[PDB]
C-alpha cells in the first residue's frame, strides 16, 4: 500500500460579491458635527478591512475589542460606522473609560467596546480662512451621556436656579460651541475626521464579514481540498456528468462524497480517492 500523502492543500471559494462600500464613509464630501453624528448601518456584504489597515493615510487606528489582523477572519451579524470631526487634542477622548467635554456628553463609548476607532487629519477640507463654522459641539448638559446616545436638542442650558425662559442671561448658556477652524493653526487644534466602527454579534446569523481567500486549482495531483467548508482529499479531474443548478455536492452509493463543483467556473469535478493499495 503506497499510501502517500497529498502534496499540499488548496482552498477555493466563490467569487468576490458586493464590495461593501466603505468608500462613502471615508471619502465623503462633508462629515457631521460631533454633537449630531451619523450612524450609517452596514448589512450583508463583504467587508475588506485590509485596505483600511494598510492605507498609510490615517493617524489613529487604535483597535480595542479585536485584533486588527483577525478582522478578516471573525464574522459579524452587523457593523455600524459613526462619523464626525473633532480637534486634534480631543481624539484621545474617543476611547472607553474617558472623560472630557467631547467624550462625556458628546460621544460616549461603552467600557465593553468591541469595535474600534479610525481618525485622520484633514486640514485641507474642513478649514478655511476666516473660520469654518459648520462644525459645532456641545459643552453644557444637565447630565452625562450613557454610551452610544445622541443628543441634538438645543434648549438653553440653565446653570443656576433662576428661571431662564428660552433666552440667554445670567446663568443661561447656549449649549453649543463652534470650532474656529482656520488654516493657520497648530496641530491639536486642526480638524480630525473620525470614523468609529462597532461590530455587533446578534442572535441572527452573521451576514457582514470578510472575503475568503481562494487559490488556483490543480488537476491530476493529490491535494487537500476545501470547497465552501467541505474538506477531504483525493484527485480532482473532469467528469462527463451533470449537477442540477442548485446542487453543489453529491453523495455516492454507500453514502460518501464523490463529486464536488468548484465555485469559480461552475465546472464539475470528481473527488476520486487517491490510489491506495
Amino acid at each position, epitope marked *: 500500500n503506497f499510501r502517500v500523502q497529498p502534496t499540499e492543500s488548496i482552498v477555493r471559494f466563490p467569487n468576490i460579491t458586493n464590495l461593501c462600500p466603505f468608500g462613502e464613509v471615508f471619502n465623503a464630501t462633508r462629515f457631521a458635527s460631533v454633537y449630531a453624528w451619523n450612524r450609517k448601518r452596514i448589512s450583508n456584504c463583504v467587508a475588506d478591512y485590509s485596505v483600511l489597515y494598510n492605507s498609510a493615510s490615517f493617524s489613529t487606528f487604535k483597535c480595542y475589542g479585536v485584533s486588527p489582523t483577525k478582522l478578516n477572519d471573525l464574522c459579524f451579524t452587523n457593523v455600524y460606522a459613526d462619523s464626525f470631526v473633532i480637534r486634534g487634542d480631543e481624539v484621545r477622548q474617543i476611547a472607553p473609560g474617558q472623560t472630557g467635554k467631547i467624550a462625556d456628553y458628546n460621544y460616549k463609548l461603552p467600557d465593553d467596546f468591541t469595535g474600534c476607532v479610525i481618525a485622520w487629519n484633514s486640514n485641507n477640507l474642513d478649514s478655511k480662512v476666516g473660520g469654518n463654522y459648520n462644525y459645532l459641539y456641545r459643552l453644557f448638559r444637565k447630565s452625562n451621556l450613557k454610551p452610544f446616545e445622541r443628543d441634538i436638542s438645543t434648549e438653553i442650558y440653565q446653570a443656576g436656579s433662576t428661571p431662564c425662559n428660552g433666552v440667554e442671561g*445670567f446663568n443661561c448658556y447656549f449649549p453649543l460651541q463652534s470650532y474656529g477652524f482656520q488654516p493657520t493653526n497648530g496641530v491639536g487644534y486642526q480638524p480630525y475626521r473620525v470614523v468609529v466602527l462597532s461590530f455587533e454579534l446578534l442572535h441572527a446569523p452573521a451576514t457582514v464579514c470578510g472575503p475568503k481567500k481562494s487559490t488556483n486549482l490543480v488537476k491530476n495531483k493529490c491535494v487537500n481540498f476545501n470547497f465552501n467548508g467541505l474538506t477531504g482529499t483525493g484527485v480532482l479531474t473532469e467528469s462527463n456528468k451533470k449537477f442540477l443548478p442548485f446542487q453543489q455536492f453529491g453523495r455516492d452509493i454507500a453514502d460518501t462524497t464523490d463529486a464536488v463543483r468548484d465555485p469559480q467556473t461552475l465546472e464539475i469535478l470528481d473527488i476520486t480517492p487517491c490510489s491506495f493499495g
Partner: antibody
Amino acid sequence: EVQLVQSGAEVKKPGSSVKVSCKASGGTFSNYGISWVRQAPGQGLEWMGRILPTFGTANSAQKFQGRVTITADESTGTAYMELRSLRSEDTAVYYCAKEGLAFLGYGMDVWGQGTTVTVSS
Amino acid sequence: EIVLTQSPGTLSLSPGERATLSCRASQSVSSYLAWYQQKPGQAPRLLIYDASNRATGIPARFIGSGSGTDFTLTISSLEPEDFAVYFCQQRSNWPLTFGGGTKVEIKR
C-alpha cells in the same frame, strides 16, 4: 475672510427711533453669533446685546431690555439693532462684531465699521 | 455683574521699552478674558483671547497671562504702531462687561 458692512451715520431727535443694520459681506449668515457694542464720544466701550442668527436667539443687557430689539434676516444676511426712545445720552458709535457661537470663550474677532448716531434737537 | 478695572490709567513710556497692563477682575472669571486694541478713529481689534491665546495675524510680542481675578498683558518691544487704547473684556457670563482702558502714550 468675513466682512461686516454697516449702515451710515444717522442724525436723529430725542424720543425717536433708530435702526442700525450690520449686513454680512459675503452672502448669508452661518453659525456666527453677532453682538452689538457702542462707544460714547471720548469714553470706553459698552456691550448691549447679541443675537444667534441661525438658531433664532437674541436678547440684550438688563440695562437695555425693553428698549432694544435685535433681529436678523437670514435670507439677506442682515442683522438689525432697532433702538427706541432715543435719549440725548444715547449718542455714540455703534459697532457690530461676530464672536463665535457660544458667549463664553473666543471673543469678537471681526468687527464692523461704526455707525455714528447723533441724537439732538 | 462682574466689574473689571484696569491699572494704570495712562502708562506712558518710550519706544522700545516693555509695557505691563493689568485687568484686575472683581469677581472671578475662570480664564476667559479678551484683550482689544483701539487706535484713534478706528474699530477695536482682538489681540489675546482666553487670556493666553494670540489671535490670528497678531505679532508675537503681545503675550498675555494670569488667571482667576488678576490678569496681565505684556508687550515685549514697543513699536510706533503699538501706542493705542487697550481694553479687556470678561467673557465669563452675562453680560460681557468691558474695562476702563489704558492710553499707552509716548514719553519725551
